[model samples]
Target: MVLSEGEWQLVLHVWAKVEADVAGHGQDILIRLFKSHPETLEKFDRFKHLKTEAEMKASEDLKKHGVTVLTALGAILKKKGHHEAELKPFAQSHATKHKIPIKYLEFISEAIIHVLHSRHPGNFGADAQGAMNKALELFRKDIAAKYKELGYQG
Candidate 1:
């Protein structure tokens, strides 16, 4: 799935606006995901016990994981369409080692968009968000397909 040139430009522009605090935005996305869909935490061993917002804020592992996620996202943005290869290993692990359900990716995707909007209200406009959402949608579908191929159930 190829994002149009305009879409890529819009997304990359908004991404540049919040790129400095990439880790912070990543953490916010996780917190939003957990707050809205608490069950997802059960799949993340490091975060399983972080039920409260304060704990979420305090967890060192959460901060590290946030950086990891944002780093992966930055890598994806750099490669653009070639991101499929970059994300495959994550899909493989999430499907095999993590045994995370494919459906939960939806929450992550939504949380990302929400966090971007929350952090950069003026820069991440509707059109920019739509472009980012499209990119995320492609990733979600790619993950789901990878899960099925990896024989992960539920």
Candidate 2:
């Protein structure tokens, strides 16, 4: 299916978010999120089915961004005065970028929290919250860079 620019943006972010969840937490959380958020899955066949060229292409593109963002996030996690909880607001901000409902971000945030808690139970104190925030910040930067790299004026 053809995707509008805004819809494509949502697809990119949601793909990144779910990919991270699957890699970090496991297939369980990823499955649950997709099952719970079928609206986000409608555009992407892989989420509802198996892999395809679209999935491969999207994954390859987002993987490059993820490497850059995740590396920066790991660094920012250790630095002074970093706050991970800000990811909540960062997620919400994308509602404007993709022109979708903020509810999508809310669902994404919930999925993130579920994955984080499940993967590293009892590890995420206030400090860990900061780390997650930095990760989200870096992900935002990656998004901007990815847009530029693809020749989009943003």
Best by TM-score: 1
Candidate number with greatest lDDT: 1
The digit string of per-residue lDDT tens for model 2 on 76-152 reads 33332233443333333433344334344445555655666565555544455444544444445544544444444
Candidate 1's error at 150, in angstroms?
1.7
Worst 10 residues of 2 by lDDT: 74-83
TM-score against truth, every candidate:
0.92, 0.40
Relative to the unseen true structure, what is the Cα RMSD of model 1? 1.5
Local distance difference test scores for all models: 0.83, 0.44
Q: What local lDDT does model 1 show for residue 8?
A: 85
Model 1 TM-score relative to the real fold: 0.92
lDDT string for model 1 (15-72, tens) is 8876888778878888999999989889887789776999998887898898888888
lDDT of 1: 0.83
Candidate 2 — what's its lDDT?
0.44
Clashes of each: 0, 4
